[PDB]
Design a protein around this ligand. Structure first.
Ligand code: HHT
Ligand code: HHT
Length: 119
């Protein structure tokens, strides 16, 4: 029932994401020089370095907030892709499946810890 445990769990999950090849297009903000129309389609850019930095600065209050930002990386990829068969979008789907598979217990444990605290 550790209310703070999600933070290190998210740091470890981000380490796994950064280790894998599929995260390369999502590690840093999208290069606007290589994709000049990006901000015409995407309102809120997001990347894994920004998520990790927000976490490390103590600027997430819960794993749900981190999860909303990570999901924004994947929804931005889906919205910017010219095709559902594109290389970068296909990497985003694999990374999203891995992220969802691992964030589920982090969210459940956190919500369980808060319920126990409220008793
Ligand atoms: C992650 O942003 C993208 C998502 C998709 Br889908 C296609 C291209 C980009 C730009 C980039 O390759 O950084
Ligand atoms: C850290 O990422 C992974 C680790 C393992 Br094991 C399997 C799949 C992935 C996701 C991906 O490579 O897209």
């Amino acid at each position: 029932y550790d209310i703070q445990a999600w933070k290190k769990q998210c740091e470890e999950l981000l380490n796994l994401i950064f280790q894998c090849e599929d995260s390369e297009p999502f590690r840093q903000p999208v290069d606007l020089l290589e994709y000049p129309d990006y901000r015409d389609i995407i309102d809120t850019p997001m990347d894994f370095a920004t998520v990790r930095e927000t976490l490390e600065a103590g600027n997430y209050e819960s794993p749900m907030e981190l999860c909303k930002d990570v999901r924004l990386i994947f929804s931005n990829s889906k919205a910017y892709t010219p095709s559902k068969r594109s290389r970068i979008y296909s990497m985003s789907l694999r990374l999203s499946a891995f992220f969802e598979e691992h964030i589920s217990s982090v969210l459940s444990d956190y919500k369980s810890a808060l319920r126990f605290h409220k008793r």
